[PDB]
């Protein structure tokens, strides 16, 4: 998607 | 473990150079410019994030120079700034050191949302209360921000601490001097850009703040399209056709083109029926068509929407204290100072 970081704990 | 030292100069305080050190350099993301890192500064441990951004040798970066002026709580801080070399050959790049926030705004209404879940309502306030505060403070500078969405505002999400970030489209507007229309993202944009506007107001970024209130009340984008066509024709469909008094405060070029014709949506079916009304009352103050009848930043955080968090037992969900939100400053209440008496409660 149109996300800002690579990573994230929702993922 | 590398450690990497670089002249550098400090985003707040004296001019002084000094040596800086980091380490645990790493990608987290993709940049207009070059790939952004994360680094942790070896003196104190802290993350930051270090964004480049291709200095102009004709003018002072713009965005470099609104970040050294800005100290407020709900905007991400300036650490440090250096230049270097970097993608392109030969070119000179900007190096912006900021603190490091692990999430977005976007990162949380996305979980939820693929979970079919509608995000707290105390957290919409919590973020939504934030996001007008440091927009209220930039426009006491006369700064416009031009590129509101979810994606640029951090969040640290334990403790509810939102930031804005992301600059780089943010210029001081001065009435009479126009402005480029292609700034602000699909889904965000005021329809006076989408007109393709150059004498648009501050108010831009009020419309974008009720476009990411909306998302989160419905847990996806109110106005989206590819085009903006598309974009105008759902901007339409709930408030109906813009009447030609509007359309002159938003672009009078475009008063007497062909537009759809649709009556508005009621704002109370817009939304799922146990939407709280106060929220849809808000955003319906913030999504006006006419730039000037749109909320101010200090006028939305007074809104009966937030008037839960100056409740002096407010608490986060998770047990922990709300974070600061009444440390207002002389600036940032200058718009309207005597705001404070709901702005401050007793409290506080
Ligand atoms: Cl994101």
Redesign the interface.
């Known amino acids: ?11 | 473990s590398k450690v990497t030292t670089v002249v550098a100069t400090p985003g707040q305080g004296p001019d002084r150079p000094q040596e800086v050190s980091y380490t645990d350099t790493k ?4 940049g207009s410019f070059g790939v952004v890192y994360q680094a942790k500064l070896c003196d104190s441990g802290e993350l930051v994030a270090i964004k480049k951004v291709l200095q102009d040798k004709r003018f002072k970066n713009r965005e470099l120079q609104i970040m050294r002026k800005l100290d407020h709580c709900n905007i991400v801080r300036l650490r440090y700034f250096f230049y270097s070399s970097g993608e392109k050959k030969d070119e000179v790049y900007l190096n912006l050191v900021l603190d490091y926030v ?3 705004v ?3 209404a ?2 939820y949302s693929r979970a079919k879940q509608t995000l707290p309502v105390i957290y919409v306030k919590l973020y939504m209360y934030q996001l007008f505060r440091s927009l209220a403070y930039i426009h006491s500078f006369g700064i416009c921000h031009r590129d509101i969405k979810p ?2 505002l951090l969040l640290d ?1 334990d403790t509810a601490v939102l930031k804005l970030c992301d600059f780089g489209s943010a210029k001081q507007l001065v009435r009479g001097e126009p402005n480029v229309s292609y700034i602000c993202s699909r889904y965000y944009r005021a329809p006076e850009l989408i007109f393709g506007a150059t004498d648009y107001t501050s108010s831009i970024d009020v419309w974008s703040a009720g476009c990411v209130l909306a998302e989160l009340l419905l847990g996806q984008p109110i106005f989206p399209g590819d085009s903006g066509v598309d974009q105008l024709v759902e901007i339409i469909k709930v408030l109906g056709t813009p009447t030609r008094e509007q359309i002159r405060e938003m672009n009078p070029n475009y008063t007497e083109f062909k537009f759809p014709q649709i009556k508005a949506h009621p704002w109370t079916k817009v939304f799922r029926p146990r939407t709280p009304p106060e929220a849809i009352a808000l955003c319906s103050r913030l999504l006006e068509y006419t730039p000037t009848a749109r909320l101010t930043p200090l006028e939305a955080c007074a809104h009966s929407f937030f008037d839960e968090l100056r409740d002096p037992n407010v608490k986060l969900p998770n047990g922990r204290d709300t974070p600061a939100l009444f440390n207002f400053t002389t600036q940032e209440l200058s718009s309207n100072p005597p705001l404070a008496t709901i702005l401050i409660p007793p409290h506080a």
């Open positions: 998607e149109n996300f800002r970081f690579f990573a994230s704990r929702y993922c | 990608v987290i993301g993709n692990p999430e977005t976007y990162r949380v996305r979980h994606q640029n999400p």
